[PDB]
Each structure stands twice: as C-alpha cells, then as structure tokens.
Design a protein around this ligand. Structure first.
Ligand code: DB8
Lengths: 124, 271
C-alpha cells in the first residue's frame, strides 16, 4: 500500500515527503526546531520523541531519553522509546526496527512518519 | 492468604461516566453507602508483576488521619477485577482547577483562596512527614480536591505507581525545573513540591492557568532549557510577593519547608 507510494510514483513519493515535511514543522517549529530533510533529521530519535509529546499533549522529562545522543546505541534507545510513546498513544507496534531509523532507511522513516500523519493530521 | 482483598469490584454501583482519557476512565458511583468516584486504570501490557505492585502500593494511599488529605478509600485488585481500579469519595466541587478556572456560578474570594493555600500547605506538611515519601505524579491544581465545606484536600489518588510511564508529563507548568530534567532519585522531592506550591500561589493570585497559551511540551522545554518562569503579578502585597518568591527559589535547598510556611499562611487568614 504505502510501498506503491514509495517506489512506483516517485513524484507522489515527493508529494508524500512534502506533505510530511509540512506536518512535522507545524509542530516542531513551536520549539524553534526546523526540519528540512527527512533522510537524516529523525535518525537520532530526538525529534520523534519531541514530536510525540507535541502531538499527544505531554512534555517528555529530559531524563527519560537522550536529548543529545552520543552513540549509535543511545540513538537506538531514543527511537525505541519513541516507538513506546507511539504505542502508548494507540498506534500499533511500528514495523521498522529502531536501528532502521538510526541507519537513515528512508522507507522505514517515511512509514513511521506517515502513520503519525494519518493519525494526527488535525492536531493544532 | 493475602493481608488485603481490596474492594470487591462487584459491590461497585457505576452510575455515570465522568470522563475518559489516556490513563483510563472516571465514573461517579456508589459503594457501601458512600458517594464515590471510580478510576478504572488503563495500563498497557498489564502483568502479574504490575498487579502485585499495584496491590502493594495502594495500602499506603488509605490516609484517614489528616483533614487536608483525601484518601483512596480502597482499590480493586485485578485479577479478579476486570481492571485495576481506585475509589475515592466524591468531592462535590471537584478539583481546585475546576473551582478556580471552570467556576461558572461564583468566584471564590481571596479569603477563601488564602484558606485553600493554608489547607494545601498543611496537607503537604503532613505528607512530607511520611517515611518513605509516597510517590505522586505531581502537586498541581488538578490533584487537589475541594470538599463539601470547601476544604481543600491533597488527593492520594494522584499516586504514581512503579509501573506508570515516567516519560509522559501532563501538567509540567507546576513542576520544578530540576524535576523536568533529573530523575526523582537525583532530586530533593520535598523541595520540588514547594515549587509546585509556589505555582499554586501564583494561580490563586492571578486566577489564570499558568502558561495557558502553551502546549505541555512547549512549557516543559522552555522552563527546563530557556528559563521560562511565571511573571510576578502586579498590584499584590509585598508580603504575598515575598512568599511567592521564596517558595519559587531557583535553588531547591533555599525553598522553605511546608511546615515553615504553614504559620506564615495562618497569620494571613482573616482568623
Ligand atoms: C477515584 O480516583 C480518582 C479520582 C479523581 N477525581 C475526583 C476525585 C478524586 N480524587 C474526587 N472527587 C471528584 C469529583 C468530581 O466531580 C465533582 C463535580 C465537579 N464539578 C466541576 C464543575 N463545577 C462547576 C461543578 C462541580 C470529579 O469529576 C471528574 C472528579 C473527582 C482523579 Cl482526578 C483521579 C483519580 Cl485516580
């Protein structure tokens, strides 16, 4: 389903990516954060954690994750934690492994972001 | 056999649902001649371990010995109940938040506000004598209830159980800056509660929700990382100004204890 939007409509893939970029900035700009590149700016898990709190209405205490991760392992822990926050909010366990996000797999990244978009597109 | 069976879920009379959210459902009901509120807890990946922990942690909440503390009357163990469940008496005015910010019928006067402050300080001083401290999510205007004679009472139903997600903070505007950033074991939890009381004082003075224009995530990040603080209200007495400032000291160690501010607030009463 989402895999036809990725591979065999590369100008729709670009439209999905432009859609997701607009959506994540709608929220992250409130923290004075800007996303220009979906290929890498979610790989360390920080923006996913911040995004979940913006979308579901909580603050995430800074001791609960690594705001400035200093290793591949801490980035994987951030993404795993963000996946837990997603399930807390009702989403099914995400398909990609956390390592897939840290390794900048664009498909793994856009699937996760698209599911957040499917659910939260009307949050103000 | 177990020391406590808890409250029998089958004896609860559920009357009307009050709300539902991420943490579960609140119901008005009846139990053994009491008008009650029932919290049905929603817990992801409920397990025997978490159920054991729930049952070990609930007895601490049945505090009947102080007028400014609202006990958990009891809890339903799950199993055999369908879900872990907490029961309190129904407080007719609801939370302090309801009374201050959703009070459609009358505006509480400042004599009542000072009495609320004294009530909360007395209840907090008492809770701070307990060893060990009972873990709570936070002191804030939603975790204080207003009883039928307008007595303010700290609700023990705000308990933080060992299994509940520490990663999601829903009322950060009342949380001390250090508690937004450091694990509870690395903070003085009593001093952190005094910051929360300072914000309650601000709320009683302004009759505004602190940082109402911002989302919870904005509040937490800006207070923790950008030094966002409540603005000191204009046109208040220097005495109230001074009390608010000392309770909101940036240094947790310089904040007064609750048992120190009780006599200050006693003197501010009309009687
Ligand atoms: C049982 O466990 C928990 C209970 C609670 N919450 C409550 C406790 C407690 N404690 C006590 N009493 C409550 C009374 C309530 O409604 C009273 C009517 C309010 N109106 C507001 C508007 N004005 C104009 C008219 C009056 C209420 O309503 C939702 C919630 C209450 C929480 Cl927050 C968490 C747990 Cl875990």
């Amino acid at each position: 389903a989402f895999d036809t939007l990725f591979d065999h409509a590369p100008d729709k893939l670009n439209v999905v990516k432009k859609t997701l970029i607009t959506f994540v900035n709608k929220h992250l700009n409130k923290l004075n954060l800007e996303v220009t590149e979906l290929e890498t700016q979610f790989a360390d898990g920080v923006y996913l954690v911040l995004l979940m709190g913006l979308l579901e209405g909580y603050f995430v205490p800074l001791h609960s994750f690594f705001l400035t991760p200093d290793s591949f392992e801490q980035k994987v822990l951030n993404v795993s934690f963000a996946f837990e926050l997603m399930q807390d909010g009702g989403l099914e366990k995400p398909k990609p492994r956390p390592e897939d996000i840290v390794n900048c797999d664009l498909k793994s990244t856009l699937r996760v972001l698209y599911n957040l978009f499917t659910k939260y597109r009307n949050v103000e | 056999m177990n020391k406590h069976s808890g409250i029998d879920f089958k004896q609860l009379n559920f009357l009307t649902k009050l709300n539902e959210n991420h943490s579960g459902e609140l119901w008005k009901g009846r139990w053994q001649g009491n008008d009650i509120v029932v919290k049905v807890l929603k817990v992801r990946d409920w397990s025997t371990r978490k159920s054991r922990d729930f049952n070990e942690e609930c007895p601490r909440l049945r505090i009947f010995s102080h007028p400014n503390v609202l006990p958990v009357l009891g809890a339903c163990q799950s199993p055999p109940a369908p879900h872990p469940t907490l029961i309190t008496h129904w407080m007719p005015y609801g939370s302090l938040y309801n009374v201050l910010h959703e009070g459609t019928n009358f505006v509480v006067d400042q004599s009542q506000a000072v009495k609320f402050a004294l009530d909360m300080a007395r209840g907090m001083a008492f809770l701070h004598t307990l060893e060990p401290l009972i873990p709570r999510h936070a002191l804030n205007s939603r975790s204080v209830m207003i009883d039928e004679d307008m007595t303010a009472r700290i609700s023990m139903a705000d308990v933080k159980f060992s299994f509940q997600s520490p990663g999601r903070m829903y009322a950060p505007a009342w949380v001390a800056p250090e508690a937004l950033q450091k694990k509870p074991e690395d903070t003085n939890r009593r001093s952190a509660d005094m910051w929360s009381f300072a914000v309650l004082l601000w709320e009683l003075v302004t009759r505004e929700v602190p940082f109402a224009d911002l989302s919870n995530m904005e509040i937490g990040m800006k207070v923790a990382l950008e030094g966002l603080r409540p603005t000191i209200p204009p046109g208040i007495s220097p005495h109230v100004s001074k009390l608010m400032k000392i309770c909101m000291n940036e240094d947790p160690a310089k904040r007064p204890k609750f048992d120190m501010i009780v006599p200050i607030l006693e003197k501010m009463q009309d009687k």
